[PDB]
């Protein structure tokens, strides 16, 4: 096993005199996947600039000037490659997955987008009303709105608080320009990463990137990556009630450390211990995760999940559950209680499993090519380099009970959390109450 980790192929990385960092992992695999992961997002958007990164993602495929729509797609389809991607708050990417026999072809394609997007003013005015609809859809996904609102209040006033999607008013008025104003501003090599995994031979990649990414940095600026304005965490709540809904969602959380921080490990292990439930499972007998157990015994929630969504310099360590208009309270109580237990009297026998549970997701986090690239894509971008499963291993193969306690308490005990809840929540008690739920009557 440990030998399995060790025998795992190191990841190659080397940047350009340009700025791009080119890394990737090699295997036997005929197939592969490759992508450019920009340090771009919504967080990087303004009050009138909010949306672009998206409105963008949405035209990032409809063509380039070199090869308009019908052709790009036709060139992509025709070769059997899958060009997919996203755009978060501090992370955007565009990956393709071909047969490795296309590294140089995929790579070019990549470059031709991140650099030259048609942005056909006529293509835009359509994607405009497309998003405005696609947004109206994102909307009844209470499973999400509940998170944005969480951000909305959790980081109220700052850049994170703005949703990756952006207000309707902006998407209704973004200019042919503003998009380009976004592209040319953030889409730069120093903040972009060319990563891939499959059967590829690094050098061949390099040269192709080093070949299609003929970027040239004059000024000292161009070679420098701006650090972002710190976002003020604001223990508070935001309630979008509506007893008209099947059920209510609740999401509460404390400020997260930020990728960098070594504790995100022990912390990650934390979330391992209470994990998540979801009525389909098969376990009123579940592992320690009482939140799970108790969730069953007393039919607390339809589903609950723990999360340590983190960013560059901040984060959101919490939990989110969905429950009938009626059992909302008992749930919080039982749940929030767990946090306490967690960082007041957690045991070794517990952390033991936690770890292994993480070590399982730790591994399965890297299941295939696309996913591997993700980490590489990410790793570098947010951490600085690539964290080997051999490393993560030790990182979290050395977290003892007393360490979890010391950690969670450090970020949960008597901290002012941010709660978010849409739906028939008449039953969720005020703040003070869920607030004094942060300290255990030890």
């Amino acid at each position: 096993y440990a030998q399995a980790l060790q025998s795992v192929p190191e990841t190659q990385v080397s940047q350009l005199d340009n700025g791009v960092r080119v890394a990737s992992e090699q295997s036997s695999q005929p197939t592969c996947t490759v992508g450019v992961w920009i340090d771009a997002g919504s967080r990087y958007e303004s009050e009138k600039n909010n949306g672009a990164g998206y409105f963008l993602e949405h035209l990032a495929f409809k063509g380039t000037k070199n090869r308009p729509q019908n052709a790009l797609e036709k060139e992509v389809e025709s070769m059997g490659a899958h060009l997919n991607a996203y755009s978060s708050r501090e992370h955007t990417a565009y990956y393709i997955k071909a047969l490795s026999k296309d590294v140089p072809k995929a790579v070019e394609l990549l470059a031709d987008i991140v650099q030259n997007c048609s942005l056909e003013d006529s293509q835009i005015e359509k994607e405009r009303d497309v998003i405005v609809r696609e947004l109206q859809e994102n909307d009844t996904s209470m499973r999400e709105v509940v998170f944005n609102y969480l951000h909305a209040t959790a980081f109220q006033g700052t850049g994170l608080a703005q949703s990756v999607e952006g207000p309707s008013e902006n998407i209704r008025k973004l200019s042919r320009a503003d998009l380009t104003e976004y592209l040319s501003t953030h889409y730069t090599a120093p903040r972009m990463v060319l990563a891939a995994a499959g059967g590829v031979e690094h050098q061949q990649l390099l040269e192709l990137a080093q070949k299609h990414f003929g970027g040239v940095p004059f000024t000292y600026d161009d070679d420098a990556v701006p650090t972002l304005s710190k976002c003020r965490f604001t223990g508070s709540q935001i309630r979008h009630r509506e007893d008209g809904l099947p059920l209510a969602h609740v999401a509460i959380a404390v400020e997260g450390p930020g990728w960098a921080h070594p504790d995100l490990v022990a912390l990650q292990v934390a979330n391992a211990i209470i994990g998540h439930y979801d009525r389909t499972y098969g376990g009123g007998l579940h592992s320690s995760s009482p939140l799970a157990s108790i969730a069953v015994t007393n039919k607390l929630c339809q589903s609950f999940q723990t999360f340590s969504i983190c960013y560059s310099e901040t984060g959101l360590f919490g939990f989110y559950f969905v429950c009938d208009r009626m059992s909302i309270d008992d749930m919080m109580f039982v749940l929030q209680g767990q946090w306490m237990r967690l960082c007041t009297s957690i045991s070794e026998s517990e952390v033991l499993r936690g770890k292994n549970f993480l070590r399982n997701a730790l591994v399965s986090h890297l299941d295939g090519t696309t996913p591997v690239c993700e980490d590489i894509g990410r790793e570098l971008l947010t951490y600085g380099r690539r964290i080997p499963l051999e490393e993560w291993e030790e990182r979290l193969a050395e977290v003892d009970a007393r360490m979890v306690r010391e950690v969670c308490s450090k970020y949960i005990y008597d901290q002012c959390p941010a709660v978010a809840g849409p739906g028939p929540i008449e039953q969720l008690p005020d703040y003070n109450r869920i607030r004094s739920g942060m300290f255990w009557l030890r």
Binding site: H240, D430, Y431, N432
Partner: protein, 48 residues
């Protein structure tokens, strides 16, 4: 008629210094706790 006199006023003294000290304290506490509401803000957002 009332030997307690002194003992009774001295007492009164202290009693007055506690009110002085205690009531504000709990006043903060009362406000501290209500701010959640005093602060608060509504908004009606139907779909149209």
């Amino acid at each position: 008629a009332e030997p307690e006199h002194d003992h009774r006023k001295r007492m009164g003294l202290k009693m007055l210094l506690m009110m002085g000290l205690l009531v504000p304290l709990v006043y903060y506490m009362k406000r501290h706790k209500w701010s959640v509401l005093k602060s608060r803000k509504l908004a009606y957002r139907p779909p149209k």
